[PDB]
Amino acid sequence: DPFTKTSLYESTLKNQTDLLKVTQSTVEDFRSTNQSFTRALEKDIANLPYQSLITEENIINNVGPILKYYRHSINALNVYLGLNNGKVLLSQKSMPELRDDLDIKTKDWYQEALKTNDIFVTPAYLDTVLKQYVITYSKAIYKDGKIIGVLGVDIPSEDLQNLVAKTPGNTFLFDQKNKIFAATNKELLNPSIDHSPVLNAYKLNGDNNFFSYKLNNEERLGACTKVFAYTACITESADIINK
Ligand SMILES: CCC[C@@H](C)[C@H](N)C(=O)O
Ligand SMILES: [Cl-]
Ligand SMILES: [Cl-]
Ligand code: NA
Ligand code: NA
């Protein structure tokens, strides 16, 4: 009876929408926690007197400890300050030392921090030295208008993937390239799975707009929404409305 099917459809829409929100929140809160951390670090570095910031030895001795304590406080992989001479002061998981081999002026985290007055957030990428996938938060630090260097903080992208996977619902994230990035059902991360149906249904319907689509000639229901450069989706079987 249409009345019954409408009731089930309105219920499941609300539910699935709510769960999609949870996944959206997860991504937002991950980012903002890392941003706040980075901002606080910026502030403590810029607070130092110039004298502590204007020689490399002073950077080592005065900024290094700050990098280290901050790194430990959140269990970041790397926390670092890149200088215009190409050297980096690096605090890494497993005192901080100056490194001259990290080709920083070719790195987006460095370049892009100098082109915005905000924190820059990279797509996930393979960390040069630790060979883990990371998301980097970078920020050009200025003390009274004078550039000191570019701060970077590397957080394992697995941390976000794990958070998303724990969420209720069959929710998942695509990265900026529409490749699968995280999922509650680990099987979805098969790079051979085609997601065209879901992605085409999202493109037709827009953010947070519930839709029908087919899998193996069965009916499924879902929704997606943009969250920063990610696309977050939920889908379920339409058996809840049909049977
Ligand atoms: C070993 C620190 C690497 C940092 C500077 C950064 N993750 C990069 O790959 O450029
Ligand atoms: Cl993020
Ligand atoms: Cl952002
Ligand atoms: Na958080
Ligand atoms: Na991305």
Numbering used by the authors: 39 to 132, 137 to 285
Manuscript excerpt for this entry:
Small molecules in the environment can be sensed as attractants or repellents by a repertoire of chemoreceptors termed methyl-accepting chemotaxis proteins (MCPs) or transducer-like proteins (Tlps). Analysis of the crystal structure of the LBDs of C. jejuni Tlp1 and Tlp3 revealed that they have a double Cache (dCache; calcium channels and chemotaxis receptors) fold. dCache domains consist of two tandem subdomains (termed membrane-distal and membrane-proximal) that likely emerged through tandem segmental DNA duplication. We also discovered eight new small-molecule ligands that, in addition to isoleucine, signal through Tlp3 as attractants by binding directly to its LBD, and determined the crystal structures of the respective complexes. The hydrophobic side-chain binding pocket and the conserved protein residues that interact with the ammonium and carboxylate groups of the ligands determine the specificity of this chemoreceptor, which appears to have evolved as a receptor for natural non-polar amino acids.
To identify candidate signal molecules of this class, we generated a virtual library comprising ~2600 L-isoleucine analogues and screened it by docking into the known L-isoleucine binding site of Tlp3 LBD. The three water-soluble compounds with the lowest predicted free energy of binding (4-methyl-L-isoleucine, β-methyl-L-norleucine, and 3-methyl-L-isoleucine) were selected for the subsequent experiments. In the thermal shift assay, the ΔTm values for all three compounds (2.8 °C, 3.7 °C, and 2.0 °C) exceeded the 1.0 °C threshold, suggesting their direct binding to Tlp3 LBD. Among the non-natural amino acids, α-amino-N-valeric acid showed a slightly lower affinity for Tlp3 LBD (168 μM) than isoleucine and leucine, followed by β-methyl-L-norleucine (Kd = 294 μM), 4-methyl-L-isoleucine (Kd = 324 μM), and 3-methyl-L-isoleucine (Kd = 484 μM). The side chain of β-methyl-L-norleucine makes van der Waals contacts with the side chains of Tyr118, Leu128, Leu144, Trp151, and Val171 and approaches within 4.0 Å of the side chains of Gln130 and Asn116. Increasing the length of the carbon chain beyond five atoms decreases the binding affinity, as seen with β-methylnorleucine (Kd of 294 µM). Our crystallographic analysis provided a structural rationale for this phenomenon: the strongly hydrophobic side-chain-binding pocket can expand to accommodate molecules with the carbon backbone of up to five atoms in length, while longer linear side chains (such as that of β-methylnorleucine) are flipped to the outside of the pocket, which reduces favourable van der Waals contacts with the protein and, hence, lowers the binding affinity.
